[PDB]
Amino acid sequence: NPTVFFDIAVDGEPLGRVSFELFADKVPKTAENFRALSTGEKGFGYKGSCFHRIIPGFMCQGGDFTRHNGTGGKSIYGEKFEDENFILKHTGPGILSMANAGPNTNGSQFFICTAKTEWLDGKHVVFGKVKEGMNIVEAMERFGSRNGKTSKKITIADCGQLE
Amino acid sequence: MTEYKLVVVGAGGVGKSALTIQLIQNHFVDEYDPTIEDSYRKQVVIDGETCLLDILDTAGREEYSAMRDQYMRTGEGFLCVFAINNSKSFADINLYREQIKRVKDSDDVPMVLVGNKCDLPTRTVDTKQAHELAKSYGIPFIETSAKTRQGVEDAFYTLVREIRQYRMK
Numbered sequence A: 001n002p003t004v005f006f007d008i009a010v011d012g013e014p015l016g017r018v019s020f021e022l023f024a025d026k027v028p029k030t031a032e033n034f035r036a037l038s039t040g041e042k043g044f045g046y047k048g049s050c051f052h053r054i055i056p057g058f059m060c061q062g063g064d065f066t067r068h069n070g071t072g073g074k075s076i077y078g079e080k081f082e083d084e085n086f087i088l089k090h091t092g093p094g095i096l097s098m099a100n101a102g103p104n105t106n107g108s109q110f111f112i113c114t115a116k117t118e119w120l121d122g123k124h125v126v127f128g129k130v131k132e133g134m135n136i137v138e139a140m141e142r143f144g145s146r147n148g149k150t151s152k153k154i155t156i157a158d159c160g161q162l163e
Numbered sequence B: 001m002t003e004y005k006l007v008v009v010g011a012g013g014v015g016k017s018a019l020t021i022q023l024i025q026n027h028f029v030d031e032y033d034p035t036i037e038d039s040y041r042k043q044v045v046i047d048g049e050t051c052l053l054d055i056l057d058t059a060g061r062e063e064y065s066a067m068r069d070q071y072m073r074t075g076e077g078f079l080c081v082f083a084i085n086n087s088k089s090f091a092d093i094n095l096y097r098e099q100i101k102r103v104k105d106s107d108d109v110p111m112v113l114v115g116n117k118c119d120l121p122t123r124t125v126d127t128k129q130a131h132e133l134a135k136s137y138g139i140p141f142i143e144t145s146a147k148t149r150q151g152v153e154d155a156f157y158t159l160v161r162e163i164r165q166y167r168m169k
C-alpha cells in the first residue's frame, strides 16, 4: 500500500505533516485517485487547497482544488467516479474516506474522521487512514466550528508520495 | 427594533439557501452546495416598521431528521419551501409541517408555503394544488424564483407579517 503526505499550514504558518496509508489492496481505484491527486502528476491536485469544513467531534473535510469553496474538485477519471466498494467502515479517528453528492459521485473531496461516524458506513468509500501525524489532525479541530466554517485558512501547503 | 426568528425548511435541493442568500447577499450561484447550517441577520423595513430578521438556513436531509427538533423549538416562523418541478418535495412539505406542529405543540405556528424555481418551464406541481394545500393549513402561499429574485422579499416579509399577527393576540 502506498503512503502519501500532507504538510498542513495555518494562515501560511507550518503546523506539521500528516501521512496516510492508502488501501490500494482493497480499494485500488479510489486509492489511486488520492495518490495521483497528492502528487499532482495529472497536472492538478491537492497542493494549495484548503480544508473548507472542520467540525470538531466529527471530521475535517477538504480536497476542492478547482473552486476553492467546497463545491468543486474532480477525480483523475473525470468529474466523478463510482463507489468502488463499502468494505471498510468509519470505525474511529483517523479514517480517510471520500466525500460525495450521493451514490457514485466521488471526485477529489475527502474527509478525515476525528471520531467514529458509523452512520456514514455504506454511503462513503473508506480508502485509507492516518499513519503519522494524528496529533496534527487533532490540532486542526480548534480552527473549525459547529457548522464547519474555519476561523483561519487551513491549507495543504505541500503534498506528495512517500517512498 | 423588533426581532423575528425565521427558519427556512424543506427537502434537499429545493432552494432554501438560494432564497436566503438572495435575501442576504443579493446574488445567486448555480452550484451544488448543500448546507450544514447557517445563521444570518438582516435589518429590513416591513409595512413601515424596522424589523431585525434572524434567519436560520437548515439542511434538507432526511437522514438527519432528528436534528431538526432543536431549531424548531427556537424558531418563531417557518418558511416551508418546495420546488415546483419536484413533486416529492411538495409531498415532503407535510412531513415538515407535522414535525413543527408536534415539536411546538401547536396548530397556530407562523408559516408560509413557498413554491420555488418558478423560472423553470417544466412545472410538475400546479399552482392550484399548492394553493389548496396552503389553504388547508391556513397559511399564505408565495411563488418564488431565487434565480431571478421573483417573490423572494415577498416570501420572507409575508412570514414576518404572520409572526406579527401571531404576537398581537
Ligand SMILES: CCn1c(-c2cc(N3CCN(C)CC3)cnc2[C@H](C)OC)c2c3cc(ccc31)-c1csc(n1)C[C@H](NC(=O)[C@H]1C[C@@H]1C)C(=O)N1CCC[C@H](N1)C(=O)OCC(C)(C)C2
Pocket: A053, A055, A058, A059, A061, A070, A071, A072, A098, A099, A100, A101, A109, A110, A111, A117, A119, A120, A124, A146, A147, B032, B033, B034, B035, B036, B037, B059, B061, B064, B067
Ligand atoms: C443536521 C446537521 N448535520 C450534521 C450533524 C449530525 C449530528 N449527528 C448525526 C449522528 N448522530 C448519531 C449524532 C448527531 C450532529 N451534529 C450535526 C451538525 C454539527 O449540526 C449542525 C451532519 C450534517 C451533514 C450535512 C448536513 C447537515 C448535517 C451534509 C451536507 S453535505 C453532506 N452532509 C455530505 C458531504 N458532501 C459534500 O460536502 C459535497 C458537496 C461536496 C462535493 C460529504 O461528503 N461529507 C463527508 C462526510 C461528512 C459530511 N460531509 C459532513 O460534513 O457531515 C457533518 C456531520 C456533522 C458529520 C453530520
Ligand SMILES: Nc1nc2c(ncn2[C@@H]2O[C@H](COP(=O)(O)OP(=O)(O)NP(=O)(O)O)[C@@H](O)[C@H]2O)c(=O)[nH]1
Pocket: B010, B011, B012, B013, B014, B015, B016, B017, B018, B019, B029, B030, B031, B032, B033, B034, B035, B036, B058, B059, B060, B061, B116, B117, B118, B119, B120, B144, B145, B146, B147, B148
Ligand atoms: N432554476 C433555479 N434553480 C434554483 C433555484 N433555487 C435554487 N436553485 C438551484 O437548485 C440547487 C439547490 O439549491 P440550494 O439553494 O442549494 O438548495 P437547498 O434547499 O438549500 N439544499 P440543502 O437542503 O442541501 O441545503 C442549486 O443548483 C441551485 O442553484 C431557483 O429559483 N431556480
Ligand SMILES: [Mg+2]
Pocket: B016, B017, B018, B033, B034, B035, B057, B058, B059
Ligand atoms: Mg442549503
